[PDB]
Amino acid sequence: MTFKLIINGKTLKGETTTEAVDAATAEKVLKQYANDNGIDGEWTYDDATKTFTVTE
């Protein structure tokens, strides 16, 4: 299952995808991708659309 990351950055926006089996499996790599760029804020997750969005 392919996931999609949504980094709603007012100063710097971006996105990335990673192959995973569960929302927790992908979030593990996704959360690291954002954090690596000094990104931190309101982390949200959707089970219906299966997409993650972070409102900085």
List the chain domain ranges.
1-56
Nearest Cα neighbor of 56 from 45, 44, 40 is 40
By what technique were these coordinates determined? NMR
Nearest Cα neighbor of 49 from 11, 5, 12, 7 is 5
Determine how many CB atoms are found less than 10 A away from the CB of residue 25.
14
Report phi then psi at 11, rounded to 5: -100, -30
CA dist list (Å): 26 to 5, 10, 20, 33: 9, 24, 5, 11
- In the chain, which residues are followed by a C-to-N distance beyond 2.5 Å, i.e. a gap? none
**Alpha-carbon gap, residue 11 to 55, rounded angstroms:** 12
**Alpha-carbon gap, residue 50 to 35, rounded angstroms:** 20
CATH class of 1-56: alpha beta
